[model samples]
Structures are given as structure tokens and as C-alpha cells.
Target chain A: TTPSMEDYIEQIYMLIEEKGYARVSDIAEALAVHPSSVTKMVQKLDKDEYLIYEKYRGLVLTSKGKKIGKRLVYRHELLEQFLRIIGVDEEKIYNDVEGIEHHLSWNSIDRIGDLVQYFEEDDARKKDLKSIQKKTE
Target chain B: PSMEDYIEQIYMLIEEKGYARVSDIAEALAVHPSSVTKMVQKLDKDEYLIYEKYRGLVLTSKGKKIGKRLVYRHELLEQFLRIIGVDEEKIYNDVEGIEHHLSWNSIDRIGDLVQYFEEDDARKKDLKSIQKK
Candidate 1:
């Protein structure tokens, strides 16, 4: 899929995951674009079979979108954390990851996952990992 | 609210495209010429909107509140769509179906949960663990 397409799908999944559903206006508000712009994107997405659309009605994901969205969200979450662990500020890093998630390499994710594991391991070595995780956080 | 819908869409069309005609709303929404005409008339009657004989519709004070809500909802969903790797296109369509059906309570829950997910380092730890369901 094109990055644009993936971005839309990601938008759908996250909205569903968080809001339980999303609307054209909700998307327009999120992106700070116009609802008509959102509508155009919706029409394209409907054509893609990622969701169902009816005039003045809300959209719902297809089974395929639901499945893919779950994975997509998981990946973004992992990547965002990976960046933060290395001391990148969370907001800026996630904003960058928003741009990067569309094209992030599986290999790169693998490497980052390993680094997080190593980060945890370092805490363990210092007798602090479990405590860091266990504190009334 | 149905009247509000028209004003909101008109506002969005104008806001997004910088101009709107009866045809723009019809085309953007994929509705019939006659249906839009009827709806536009209703919006004018409600004082939520104003229309030129041929210049298309404009929002009044009442209309603007509803229009801004539409704008707000769309933008919020768009952010979630981008962050999660969903189709922006699908999100646009999907959210349309979802916005009105949701309760204020539900939206509030989602908003709070979104914050929870954002701030809870413990939740981040749980992501990799896949706790027993």
C-alpha cells in the first residue's frame, strides 16, 4: 500500500481503538483539515474495502482493517517507546514516528526491539529494572 | 440536527475548498441535486444558515457552533488515524458513521483513555507482555 493509504488505515484503527468509532468530522478535526478533504479521503478508503461508508453515516472497518490496524498500532507504540528510551522527547519523537511509521523497516523494528530488551537488561544488571517496573507506577 | 448537518457540511466544504456551491455539497457527499436543494432550504429556514439565490449557503451563529463541532470531530479522528497506521481515507469515511452515534460519555471515556494510554509507563510495559486474557 502507498504511505498515504497506510496513513488513512492507521487513522481508522486508532480511532476505533480509542474512540470506539470515528466520524468524518472527527478525522477532519484530528488532521486539522476540512471535512470535505476528509470526505474525499473517505471515498478513497471506501473504494479500498477498508471500511463501509454511507452518506451522512459513520464508517466502520472491514475485518481486514481491524486486523491490520491492531498490528499497526502495536508497531507504532513500540517504535515510540524505543525512541523515547534513547532520550528523544516523547512528543517530538512520536510526531516524527507518525511520519516514519508509514515506511519503517521490519529490520529496524527488530533492532529497536532488541535495544529495548537490552535497555531492560541493563536495568536488571544494575538491580533496578524490576524496581523501575514495580514502583506504584 | 439534520439541518445542522447541512450547515456543517457546507461550512466544511467552504473551509476546505475555499468555496462551495450546491453542486459541491452534492458532489462531496454524493447526494442528489434535489436532495441537496431540499436540505439547503431547510437550513435557511432554521436561521442556522443563510443562502444566496445562487451563491450557495453560509453559516449563521447557530450554524457555526454545529459546523465547528464537525470540524473538531474530524480533526481528532484524523490524528488517531495517522498515529495508528490506518488508511486516512478509511478514517474519513469510517468516522462519519461513528460521530453521531457516540454518546458524550463514550467520547469522554475515549478521550481519557487516550490520555491514560499516553501517560502510563506501566501500560507500555504491558504491551510486550501480552497478559493472560
Candidate 2:
């Protein structure tokens, strides 16, 4: 709604999944990051004018912000998908992807997409990589 | 530390079939021999290693040390990624994307993060549950 604009955008998506729209406090509570801290970062995007506040929604993405948000979520899901492929338990995938998603290059994301598809073609090969994880246990 | 790659690869090349040669790194890193020429000289002066006139070179202690750490750095990141559920080619590819040229400060901290996730059962359970949502 208001803000490279990675961190808070995920929060907005999280809220949209749960409720119809986003508010600043929802972002704060979802992360427990602190109230005013989010406000300052929120204000930077809001500084673009009329993006962060809507009187009632308090924070809502404009169409442009929504585009960015969707792209980010897509990247996030690909990462989660890749993690799941290698047999990382889902919770660890979530936590690792959260730290990694913002830092990753589009090329890296695209490369993982290739690996995912390539593995899908041959379940036997996918199982080969997945088998490495079972050995860790 | 982009040059860290030369040393890292040189170490890898030497440990392979035979001692490292100019063409090995040129092919391995896919850089021009001319480009690598300038760098190997720079590394020579910087005392990471010594380069003979044409092709072959001997790895110095400083060079080997950097190579060792970088290779370890590469392996640790890959291991962390793999054990964390990343697949094969991606681990090989992704490490180059994010792990190389990273600061030791961050890598050391990540070292702890991955290690703690390995050793601490309580946190592993906590991290495991977090993944479910």
C-alpha cells in the first residue's frame, strides 16, 4: 500500500487472504515487529501520496501496488514450491523463504522454476534429489 | 571479493586431476585468458599466489587460505540450502547467486543459524511448526 517495498507487501497479502483489505495494525500484529516501526516504512510508500491510507482501510494497495504485491507473492510461492520439492518440511520452508525471497534475484527464481518443471517431467530424477533429504534423517 | 572466485576455482582445479593451469580456470570460470591474465598478475602482486610467465602457477598460503574458506563458504551455503529442502542443480546454481561475494559477517551469522537449526531440537520443532502455516 505504501512503500524496494518487499517486507510490508507480504503482510498486506497475508491480510488480504484473511480479510478483504489491509490496515497498518494488521501488518504490525502479523509480524509483531512494533507499531511505529512499520508506520515509518509505511509512510515512505504513503509518501507517494494517497497509497497507504484510505480513512477506513487505513492501508490499501492501489492497482500499481497490487501488481507489485502479486508479483512478490508469485515469487514467494515459487520459493515455497522449490523448498517443498527438495523435501524441506513446510514450516522450515516458510521461515527460510521469508528471509530469502526479498534477497533473491529474478534469475535465481526463474532458475528454480526451471528446476521445478524439469523435475516434474521425470519423477524418478525428482525422487533422486528428494532422496538426499531423507538420508539426512 | 569477486577475485575470491579465481582463488577458489584455482584451488578446486589443483585438487583435481593435476595442478591448476590458466586454461582450466579460463574454461571453468568461462572468462577470457586475457581477463584472467590481468587478475592472476594482480593476485601475484597481492601475494595470494605466484604466477609463472606463461601458464602454470603455484598456490601460495594466502591464496590457498582464501580458496579454502571460499570453497567452504560455497559448500556451507549449499549444504544449508540442500538440507533445508533445496534440490540439486538449484543448490549448485543458487549459491552462486546469493552466497558468493557475500560478506563474512552475514555468512558467519548464517552459519550459526543453520547450525543451531541442526543442533537445537526445541528450535527445530519451532521452525518446523512455522513451516506448516
Candidate 3:
């Protein structure tokens, strides 16, 4: 239910893709939270129908989990890319995206996604971004 | 959910129309009057503003100070969204969701970036071309 749960959603989705499934330690290590925290998160998330944490098998996501996780990954990546292209310093960029990515509307994100593509493809725009990146950063 | 939004909206209503208070804020922000009453008392509790049961609300610098920054911060994010070609209707709806989540540092840098666009033509031209597609 809360947005933070998407972090778990994304983690398991990626972990499953990379390793076929996940364990408590796998999520705990990636999130840097205690195993007990993962255990608690698992209960609510499973009941919500997004994920299931089997006692022996560990973790598997429902299709619903994958959709939200993929969107989170996409939003997170695009926001980071947007700031980077704007010439923000690499050091501050991740947290900037972290702060911004969660709260955007779906339509807002779609428009931003459009801009990201335009910036990447336009040579002079790329140079402008590069120029801004160089001057401030 | 933020007290800052209430404080800021009230500040705007007062600045523009001269008497800023509950019913107007409910109209401006599009929530029920009861919802306004719910948060109004909490803000009153914290001394951001004084709420009157049947009359109106009065402003204070305590919340005004915070409200001031939120309005400023809200504008920058809204402007940046405009530059990237987010539609005007969308910009209004979008900024409200994001104002509190931004880091001051990101907002600061984005402010500079806004100035960068303000001073330039090529980028705006480039943006216009792509948004057509």
C-alpha cells in the first residue's frame, strides 16, 4: 500500500530475473534492511496479492507486482537520466531522482519521457545539456 | 497532506482576494469543507493560523514563512515542467503532488536550470520541435 513497498516490488522483480527467485537475505542485502523487516514486508505484500513469500521457496511475484516494479524502475531510471542530462552533478543526481521520482503523475511522467527522448536524439540539445553540465558542474 | 499547502493556499487567497479563509480554500484546493476543517484545526493547533468556527481564518508568519517557501519551490518545479513541455493543465495538477518531495538542493539546481532556459533560445526551439511529434 504505501509507495515504499514499490521498492520491495522492484527488488524482487530484478532479483527474480537475475537468479530465477529470491531469498530473505537477497532482499535484505539489496535493501540494506534487517531480515525481520523483510519478513514483515513480505506478509503485507503477499496478502495484498502482489507477492508471495513461500517458506521454503522464499519469494515470487504475481503479475501485479511485476507491473508496479517495472514502472518504478522506469520512473527511477528516467528521473536520474533527466537530471543527468540537465547537467546536475553525478553526486547529487541519485538523491535528486529519489526525491522527485516518487511523486510525479503518470501523465507528467509521459511528457517527461517524451522530453528525454527528444534530448537524446537532438545533437544541439545534447550539446546544450553537455554545456550546462560543464558550467555548473 | 502537508500543512504547507493549506498555509500557502490561504496566503494566495488573501493576497489576491483580500480575505483568505476556509470555504475559499476548500474551493481553491477542491476538498470538502470538513476536510478543510480537519486540517485547519491542526494548523491552528500548531499556531500557523487562527481558525474561527463560522467566520474565517487569519494568517501568521509561523506558517507564512513555510508557506512562502512552498509557493516559491512550487513555482520552480511548475516552471521546469512547463519548459519540458508538460501541458499547462497538467502542470497545475502535477506540481501539487511533488512540492514536498523535492530536496532543496535539487530545487536550487533546477532553478538555475530554469534560468539557463530563460537565457537560451536553441533549447526551447529544440523542445518545441520534439513536442510536436
Chain B TM-scores, listed for every candidate in order, come to 0.73, 0.81, 0.82
Candidate 1 lDDT over residue span A12-75, tens digit each: 7888788888888888777778888778887887887878886565788888778877778888
lDDT of each: 0.64, 0.69, 0.79
- The candidate with the higher DockQ, 1 or 2, is 2
Native RMSD of candidate 3 (Å):
4.3
Question: Across residues A84-124, which tens digit of lDDT does each residue of candidate 2 receive?
Answer: 66555555667667766765656556645655565565577
DockQ of each: 0.02, 0.06, 0.36
The sequence of per-residue lDDT tens digits that candidate 3 reaches over residues B1-133 is 4667777788888778876867899998889999989998888889988865655787677867777787898888888888877778878767887777666766766786677678777767876777687
Local error of candidate 1 at A5, Å? 2.3
- The reply for model 2, stretches above 4 Å from the true place, is A1-4, A131-137, B1-70, B75-97, B100-133
Over 4 Å off, model 1: A55-57, A124-137, B1-133
lDDT-superior candidate, 2 or 3: 3
Q: TM per model?
A: 0.44, 0.52, 0.73
Question: What local lDDT does model 2 show for residue A109?
Answer: 65
- State which candidate has the highest DockQ: 3
User: Which regions of candidate 3 deviate over 4 angstroms?
Assistant: A17-20, A25-52, A62-64, A87-92, A117-137, B30-47, B50-56, B131-133
lDDT (tens digit, per residue) of candidate 1 on B1-133: 3454566678888788766788888887778989999987777887877886666677788887778877676566455434333444566554554455434433443343334335555544553343221
